[PDB]
Amino acid sequence: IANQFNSAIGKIQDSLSSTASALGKLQDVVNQNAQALNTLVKQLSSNFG
Amino acid sequence: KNKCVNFNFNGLTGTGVLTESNKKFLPFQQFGRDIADTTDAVRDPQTLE
Numbered sequence: 001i002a003n004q005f006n007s008a009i010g011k012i013q014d015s016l017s018s019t020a021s022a023l024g025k026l027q028d029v030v031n032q033n034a035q036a037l038n039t040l041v042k043q044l045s046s047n048f049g
Numbered sequence: 050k051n052k053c054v055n056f057n058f059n060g061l062t063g064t065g066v067l068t069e070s071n072k073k074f075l076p077f078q079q080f081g082r083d084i085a086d087t088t089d090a091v092r093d094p095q096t097l098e
């Protein structure tokens with residue numbers, strides 16, 4: 001049971017070191033914050049007539 | 050330079066602190082602009098810096 005657990009924690013290191021897709025639930029929050037701010041700065045360019 | 054100043058260059062009135070830039074403008078360009086469509090570099094008409 002200890003060897004299965006130690007091996008399973010060993011796969012978490014490798015998975016997180018390897019796959020680009022994993023933390024997508026966090027990076028899409030950082031990206032929505034950044035995109036909303038860049039859109040709000042970009043709306044300073046608009047003439048509104 | 051390095052003080053806050055009510056600048057005007059060529060009718061570009063604004064407020065800010067001026068500083069010596071390292072941007073490589075071409076001879077045809079008088080102003081550089083921000084993402085916000087606001088000027089953030091200028092070539093002085095008295096001296097080409």
Ligand SMILES: *[C@@H]1O[C@H](CO)[C@@H](O[C@@H]2O[C@H](CO)[C@@H](O[C@H]3O[C@H](CO)[C@@H](O)[C@H](O)[C@@H]3O)[C@H](O)[C@H]2NC(C)=O)[C@H](O)[C@H]1NC(C)=O
Pocket residue numbers: 003004
């Ligand atoms: C319950 O499942 C276990 C797997 O999670 C299993 O453990 C594994 O047992 C095999 C042998 O039966 C081991 O295989 C290695 O055995 C020797 C080296 O020790 C070599 O000759 C083999 O080629 C191979 O490398 C596994 O390493 C071992 N894995 C773990 C995590 O211990 C148990 O045997 C299963 N138990 C029962 C009662 O079925």
Ligand SMILES: *[C@@H]1O[C@H](CO)[C@@H](O)[C@H](O)[C@H]1NC(C)=O
Pocket residue numbers: 094095096
């Ligand atoms: C402004 O005057 C300086 C000399 O004081 C001269 O070097 C410069 O070429 C002049 N600028 C223009 C645009 O004529």
